[PDB]
């Protein structure tokens, strides 16, 4: 069950050619947008989440 990263917890950055860069390990935030008042930017000197190369017909 190796894969320190997806063993949820430590950090993993991802650089890409076509897709957007990521930072994504484990800690809270998840059970936090629920007990609300969690803003976040709307693209302040930024990137873009969910990212692309996922379509349909």
């Amino acid at each position: 069950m190796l894969s320190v990263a997806a063993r949820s917890g430590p950090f993993a950055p991802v650089l890409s050619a076509t897709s957007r860069g990521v930072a994504g390990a484990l800690r809270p935030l998840v059970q936090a947008a629920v007990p609300a008042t969690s803003e976040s930017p709307v693209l302040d000197l930024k990137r873009s989440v969910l990212c692309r190369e996922s379509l349909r017909g």
């Binding site: 650089l15 890409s16 050619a17 076509t18 897709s19 957007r20 860069g21 930024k46 990137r47 873009s48 990212c51 692309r52 379509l55 349909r56 017909g57």
Partner: peptide
Amino acid sequence: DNVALQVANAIIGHYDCTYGG
């Protein structure tokens, strides 16, 4: 018509400042 529309879109595509290249 959606398929062709989706192909043209793909040609324009996307961009983000963290894109390599």
